[model samples]
Target chain A: PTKPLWTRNPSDITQEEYNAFYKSISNDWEDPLYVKHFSVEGQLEFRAILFIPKRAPFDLFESNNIKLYVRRVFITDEAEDLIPEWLSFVKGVVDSEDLPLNLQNKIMKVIRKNIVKKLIEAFNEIAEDSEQFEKFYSAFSKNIKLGVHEDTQNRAALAKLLRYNSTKSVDELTSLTDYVTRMPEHQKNIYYITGESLKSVEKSPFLDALKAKNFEVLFLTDPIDEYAFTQLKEFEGKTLVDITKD
Target chain B: VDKNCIGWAKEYFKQKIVGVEAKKYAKIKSVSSIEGDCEVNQRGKVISLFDLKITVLIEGHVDSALPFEGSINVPEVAFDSEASSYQFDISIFKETSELSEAKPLIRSELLPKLRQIFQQFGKDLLATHGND
Candidate 1:
């Protein structure tokens, strides 16, 4: 039998109930690592269930794997622009009454913008508590790199939020903010190098020149790091230059 | 010989058997002998001898009983071609009246063979396989 299109009482559902529903619908065993439950009112009243997985799935980056649902009915998870490709690791439903079912493409773009703003705000709050942000970034820093690439509208913001290990810090990780604070008077660009491991990145020819020049370069070891700077053109008039290329 | 005797014997000595209490059991071990320049200690020698005992027990008792009937069990063995190592691991029942005597003997003798089998299996399987 076909399932119902929408729930009778969306507001009555608790976060735990919604989470269970998400797990059942998504067929994910792990409870969502994080969730953002919100309802927009006025002209377009809608409830959104945005969930970040406890750990990124094996096939998360596989072409068109994340599925989306609107009004309790399955929509296209393939809509890359639906929630910004950086947040592609997130799964769940975004059910809305006012959302135009026909203008899915247009609505998705608008929803993406709204959800990104909410995510940034939530992440900022998460970051304010130092420990939580560190825990979150340790597990899902690649997703932030994806944001740096896909979220063109907020590339600058995403760039600022990125955290990576640098040559200056022995065992600690630093953010773009940290780099800016330590930026020399003559330094103009935010230099970084992406590699498979810190050992390889540290030993790379790219870092040698930067080390010789005494310029701090962010060592990005995650696989997503390579693609991030490819998508993002520049940030804050200071271009993000990959040392590997030039 | 009786099912009741086997069942009661198994239940009485469950703790002595590695996985008798659990519905499913998986035992893994490896065995190797001292070679040129290899340090040989009392523990190492005891372990090597233990493997031989296990091989004997397995060859003796494996075909004597049924799956859940009178003192029956399955024995599996493997040898490493690359490292020239050996291993023997098996699942045995604790259903016999002599289970008390059998447990220590199996530990002292069978464990070593099982260890060798595992060592050989590890070396052979991993070396022949391309990726880690």
Candidate 2:
């Protein structure tokens, strides 16, 4: 006779409800950064309530916290097929009425596809707010960078979520979309410099010619950024050139 | 080691190569090293050739702000050579700067001319005797 918390719309649920449910499931005192309740209806039927944590957990890289349920009955939290390694930061539950306990792997694959879509949608929404996004980026930018390298299927949408500090906007972080918008008509490629840290590359000679040319080269200071950009290669028809290279 | 050659390279770079406008603001951040060797001809006169690699630091102005710092592989200077005019080759191996508004000007007008001045200096050096 009791309605499941996920059955209600996320807007209808109060912040306190979200907090209580998050604590109940996650056993953490802090509130989640964002929460979403989504359902998949065609060919498969399932409901999922996902959370993006405020702070990165110590076991973020090693943990798969998405719980599985069948018809509101708790099944298992050890499902690896539901979330990929790059998305290990995502935490929540997926409950399905159509999944069989014996042969759930195939059905879960179908659900998994939809889960990633909804998660990206939630992330896009979070990116609209400047203050909230900075916090979210600080906590999970590495996860998204890894996703750009790993998820070939959803790379474009994930690329939209990328952010960085550039020569033009060193004080504020700029998205790739923003970078493209401000690019000059003569500019052919997106330039970037990778180094151990901002201080190391800020005064680098590699930037001299480009800087003199007035190109806004991105400063990629993160360790994963070097690898992710290699996989990304180009965005919006503009080639990504490392200034340190020919 | 030819101390005069090192001093000449720095002094020539500062006075002749860098313009009067840039001379007011430009500073040599570092002079890495000068490496050279001499070859004895059949006549027994030593032909000393040396190259200087130095880093130049140019600051951004308060109004048109964008500081540039780059390492230049200064053209090889042969103190004694048979040729009156030698080929000029200089390289900017490294640098960093950002002139948001002056980029087009810097690229088209400033940098090319700066390289030309360096080339002229190399040619002038080749035409003169170091001892004189």
Candidate 3:
């Protein structure tokens, strides 16, 4: 039966059923990177099981992955407000009855708040093991970046998740948290340069002075990267400055 | 700003306007033909309501024009529609024979005069759309 794992009695369900449910909804060939299953009651009553796919969908940026079910009646798979566009890669189903459409936004906010934090921690944990975080980052950085642009409530939290190629290390990835930790003496701002590719950003003359000062700059390889800074202006109360001006 | 105003300014300035940035996410268009114009935060200034900067650069020669040169400080540069506002201040340099009519166009304060113009435009815009 194609029944959801969350529906079966917690004591009765088997590990195979959880994997089967994850495979059914996700179509992910491999097991999910992580999963969360819980029921919220009182104000609203229902189950939510959010899954992180083992691999990002090919149409990750162009498609919606969240499915909504009203009392297990398939409503639609395109539930954008289930999570922000930045978390578009997150795939799962939200099944609820009294979870009124008007209440979904506020409720979705609470569910995604923890879900996104857990996903980020998983990436960090994988990075600490090996640089496999680079592969995950390449697949999903743009999604989190748009979150930096659109989600003011979660922006600072999202900023901490960013990993970029730095002037100091051409091949290695660095986090904004790490960059600030190593920020030079009298370096009151965070500097960055955006270009078409890693190679192009590396050659940018904008880095001439800062590199001479032994300062590091984040290399943003996407056009949207710089545009995100227009929204993600300050991180940790220090402004993200553009050295491209000089 | 409306599309018509942007198009009209584009036509008026030809290539010099560079690009007009208005609210609510408009397209950015660039033009060819290098001109006697300055961009960026260049030393030579020009007034820009959009970019938060100011200066008045006069570029012209109207049918073999002005032998005189002078500067007058304007009260304010209130952004408004392309037409129907006493924004007629520019043609003062047209070097017309009877400068008498143009001189009175300049006023101590521009708002009341502009308010009258704007109200007239509002009445006309509300009047009719189909026949014309």
Candidate 4:
């Protein structure tokens, strides 16, 4: 049957058994990057199968897209605005019969918002541990910048998490919070200059004024900086003035 | 016939006027020659006044006064047929040297003065000729 129900006991299923079942059900060639399997016993009694892809999907960055389900019924992935766009790459199936099918979209949207906040908090906690955050920053700094722009309510928090190369840091990445700690007493604003590359931005005439005054200038070379700053006007009472505009 | 009378009148008018830049206008030579003419003809009633006109000079070109004759016609001037006869010309050419720094100050100071002069002139003309 197309929709066959599996009544196997949760304790009986091994890792290998679940892996084989996942492959058979998903039709995915490679093993999942990560898997979360759990059964809720309280109000909702159902098994959840969450799968992280071995590699990000080609159209993972596409807008209004997410994969979701409720009670073994395939709901809609097209109404994916519920999940933060940054977390769209994550793929999974949540099977809970207690949740009404019609209310699944609303419930998922709320859950997605909480999930993103929890994920960022967890990532920050991990980042504080050691050099792991630097590795994550190298790969996902662009997403953080986008998050700062699109999520205004959480911008001040996200602004602290932003990493960029500063004049003092040389090649090392520094967070805005760290930069604020190192800021001089007389400094009134957080100065930053953007360009196509680090080398090019370092030589910009606009940076000359701040550099001459012994002020540290953050060099943002990312492509997203162009669009991100348009929305992010100021952070922590210090205005983000574009040095390029006189 | 007194030299002091000319100086006093010039100084009084100059102090009352808004845009008169120099103090030399307040030191008139003598009042004797014009006293008889002033009593006979209404020449003394024609007060000598100075108004500033700012002109912009672009890229080494000769300065051109703005609000050029036909380009922007003042409604009051257009209404009176004899307004053309009352010519009071004073061109203050704005050069690059001081203009860059003095522009903001000039705008702040002169705009209000110009508005006051125009308003008073309009009110006086309405009072004398009756409004349309």
Q: Pick the candidate with the highest lDDT.
A: 2
Count clashing pairs, candidate 4: 0
Q: In model 1, where do residues sit more than 4 Å from their true spots? A: A1-30, A42-44, A63-81, A84-86, A101-104, A129-131, A193-197, A200-214, A220-227, A230-233, A241-246, B1-132
lDDT of 2 by residue, A79-100 (tens): 7888777788877888998788
Model 3 chain B poorest ten-residue lDDT run: B46-55
Candidate 4 residue lDDT tens string, A1-246: 444223345566567766775576556686754444545443224454444445445554553233455666767666555457766554445455544666334334334444455456555664684555655565466667778767644455576677778777777778777777787877756778888899998788887788788888888887687567655555554446567765
Error of 1 at B40 (Å): 89
Each model's interface RMSD (Å)? 33.2, 27.6, 22.7, 32.1
Among the numbered candidates, top TM-score falls to: 2
Docking class of 1: incorrect
Backbone clashes for every candidate come to: 15, 4, 1, 0
lDDT of 1 by residue, A1-246 (tens): 644323335556566776776687678887766666666654234566666665667765664434556666666757666666667666666665535554434345456656776777667767776766776687677777777765544555676677778888759878777787888878867788888889988878868888888999888787677677656534544456788763
Give the runs in model 3 whose Cα sits over 4 Å from its true position: A1-4, A7-17, A41-46, A71-75, A101-132, B1-132
lDDT of 2 by residue, B9-107 (tens): 566666644432231133334444444422221112222233333334333222334344434333233332223212222122243332233333233
Ten consecutive residues with minimal summed lDDT in candidate 4 chain A?
A1-10
True contacts kept of 1: 0.00
* Error in Å for residue A118 of model 2: 0.9
Better of 3 and 4 by lDDT: 3
Q: What is the TM-score of each candidate against the true structure?
A: 0.49, 0.62, 0.54, 0.48
True-vs-predicted CA distance for residue A237, candidate 2, Å: 2.4
Q: For candidate 3, give the DockQ.
A: 0.01
The TM-score each candidate achieves on chain A is 0.69, 0.92, 0.77, 0.68
